[PDB]
Ligand binder design. Structure first.
Ligand SMILES: O=c1[nH]cc([C@@H]2O[C@H](CO)[C@@H](O)[C@H]2O)c(=O)[nH]1
Ligand SMILES: [Mg+2]
Length: 226
């Protein structure tokens, strides 16, 4: 389906705006290794976009780890707290966000991350995160499940003033679960996947790019870059 114009943008955070997926990978690989299991791309593809407890349970079931989801979340979060503040902005993120703000294009953030995790990750990028119209987190009372449930994107769109039709919203995602949540919400979606993700998991989005740097806003009826 050819790209159609949009008026409101919704961004994922982890792996899309910030380089935090490699932080999760290292902590989960370290935990999995002690059980002689490999935290591989196949497993990672299943859990990006899930809430922390959801992700933990999947890791445990798929890799048959001898722990509870609460135990895996506690241990992993304890380790991640030391590195999350070092999160860096992904290529193209700043350019795109500043462009939208300048042309008055509303945009918002919809992340399955909880409050503390979000605070840590964005603690050193406050000027970037202040430009978003609003933020929905995974611990929001309105979000019952992580992506691919559309809850989080629907909640996000309904909080713009005035609220757009879902079909005029464009999601940006790095994860398959997030592309599926956007489609389930009735929204178009730009995917910027890691190249290690499978072909099957990277061929569902409206547009698939190697980098945010390659996004051409005019394809979606937005102002071109000056
Ligand atoms: O490798 C991983 N990446 C991401 C998550 C989860 O998804 C959210 C962001 O992708 C994050 O909050 C965590 O629950 C995970 O558990 N493991
Ligand atoms: Mg993501």
């Amino acid at each position: 389906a050819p790209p159609q114009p949009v008026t409101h943008l919704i961004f994922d955070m982890d792996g899309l705006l910030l380089d935090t997926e490699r932080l999760y990978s290292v902590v989960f690989q370290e935990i999995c290794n002690r059980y002689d299991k490999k935290y591989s791309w196949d497993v990672k593809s299943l859990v990006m976009g899930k809430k922390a407890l959801e992700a933990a349970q999947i890791i445990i079931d798929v890799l048959q780890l001898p722990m509870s989801k609460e135990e895996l979340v506690e241990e992993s979060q304890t380790k991640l707290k030391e590195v999350f503040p070092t999160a860096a902005l992904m290529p193209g993120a700043e350019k795109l966000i500043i462009h939208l703000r300048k042309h008055g294009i509303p945009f918002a953030l919809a992340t399955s991350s909880g409050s503390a995790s979000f605070d840590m990750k964005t603690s050193r990028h406050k000027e970037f995160f202040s430009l978003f119209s609003h933020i929905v987190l995974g611990d929001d009372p309105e979000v019952q499940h992580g992506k691919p449930d559309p809850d989080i994107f629907l909640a996000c769109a309904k909080r713009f003033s005035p609220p757009p039709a879902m079909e005029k919203c464009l999601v940006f995602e790095d994860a398959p679960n997030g592309v599926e949540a956007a489609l389930a919400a009735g929204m178009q979606v730009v995917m910027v996947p890691d190249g290690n993700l499978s072909r099957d998991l990277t061929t569902k989005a409206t547009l698939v790019l190697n980098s945010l740097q390659d996004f051409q806003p005019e394809l979606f009826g937005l102002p071109s870059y000056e």
